[PDB]
Amino acid sequence: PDSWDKDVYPEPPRRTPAPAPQTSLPNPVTYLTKIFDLLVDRPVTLAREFIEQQHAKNRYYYYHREFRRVPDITECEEKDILCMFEAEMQWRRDYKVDQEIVNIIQERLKACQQREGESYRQNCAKELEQFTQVSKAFQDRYSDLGAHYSARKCLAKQKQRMLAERKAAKEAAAA
Amino acid sequence: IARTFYDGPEKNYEKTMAILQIEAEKAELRLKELEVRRLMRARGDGPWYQYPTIDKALIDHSPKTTPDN
Ligand SMILES: CCCCCCCCCCCCCCCCC[C@@H](O)O[C@H](CO[C@H](O)CCCCCCCCCCCCCCC)COP(=O)(O)OCC[N+](C)(C)C
């Protein structure tokens, strides 16, 4: 339904074949489906309609909380505890959001694998590539941080990686 | 439950900021106090570690039966 965004959680257009009976024998699946409709789905639909009618008479809202952007650990002085605190809280929020981004991509991958049946190896290549890219970026950001990870340790890891990349590029320019 | 038993995140956030400021100031004060104690005990030019000497008002500045003190 329209509860979730279809761009964040995409699905193919869902082609289904038309029934093409080839025998005069009655189809038990259709008869049981009609019985199930009449004895299960209609009462459930009526109950839900009543509940939604009650919900309509009492309509209230909740909001998504917006967080400002505070300075990060890069422009905090060595012993400034307040800037360090706010930068660390912002970094923790960013870490949580990155985890949920990876979660969304993994959900896409799983749904693709189930949906494609026997053709999943070829038909889920884009989802596999997206998960590979996201997983590599996440591994670069947060792996090996340890039990007591902090924005300072992430900064040190990034600086070490930047130094390695700079040295590699410098020695590649010499070859 | 949130309305009845709890407060918003701002209260805890800013209380944490105040607590952190107090603790950091205490830490720097402790380090400075140790350094000041070390310097005063080494040089003796401060109000602390002022060990007594002889009071000069006990000296008798009067002629002493002999000219050469
Ligand atoms: C519709 C049916 C389903 C509803 C189920 C609701 C689930 C909740 C029921 C369980 C009880 C919760 C446990 C109580 C722990 C709360 C303790 C504390 O957090 O509450 C204080 C508040 O005190 C409350 O009054 C707690 C009182 C709970 C006492 C429990 C006693 C129940 C025992 C039952 C005895 C019945 C009779 C016995 C006969 C012998 C908070 O202090 P305060 O700083 O102010 O609040 C700050 C937030 N402000 C600023 C918005 C106000």
Place of tokens 């700079």: A166
DSSP per residue over B1-69, as a string?
-HHHH---HHHHHHHHHHHHHHHHHHHHHHHHHHHHHHHHHHH--SSSS------GGG---S--SSTT-
Measured CA to CA, the distance from residue A141 to residue A145 in angstroms comes to 9
| Cβ pair A73, A87 in contact under 8 A | yes
Q: Report whether residue B5 contacts ligand 1, using a CB cutoff of 6 Å.
A: yes
Interhelix angle for A81-116 vs B9-43, to 10°? 140
Spacing, Cα B5 to ligand 1 middle (Å):
7
Q: Does A85 touch chain B (CB under 8 A)?
A: yes
A79, two tokens:
């012993």
Q: Report whether residue B13 contacts ligand 1, using a CB cutoff of 6 Å.
A: no
Measured CA to CA, the distance from residue A166 to residue A84 in angstroms comes to 28
Spacing, Cα B3 to ligand 1 middle (Å):
12
Q: What's the longest Cα–Cα distance across chain B?
A: 99
B63, two tokens:
């002629």
**Could you tell me the CA-to-CA distances from A120 to A105, A111, A129 in Å, in that order?**
16, 10, 13
Interhelix angle for A125-142 vs A81-116, to 10°? 160
DSSP per residue over chain A, as a string?
-TTS-TTTS-------PPP---SSS--HHHHHHHHHIIIIIHHHHHHHHHHHHHHHTS-----PPP-PPPP-GGGS-TT-HHHHHHHHHHHHHHHHHHHHHHHHHHHHHHHHHHHHGGGHHHHTHHHHHHHHHHHHHHHHHHTT--TT--HHHHHHHHHHHHHHHHHHHHHHTT-
Residues from chain B that touch A89, judged by Cβ atoms under 8 A, are 13
Residues from chain A that touch B24, judged by Cβ atoms under 8 A, are 79, 81
CA B33 to chain centre: 5
Q: Does A39 touch chain B (CB under 8 A)?
A: no
Note the resolution in Å, 1 decimal.
2.6
| Cβ pair A27, A21 in contact under 8 A | yes
Residues from chain B that touch A79, judged by Cβ atoms under 8 A, are 24, 28
Q: Does B22 touch chain A (CB under 8 A)?
A: no
Q: Which residue has the least CA distance to atom 24 on ligand 1?
A: B5
Are A81 and B13 in contact (CB < 8 Å)? no
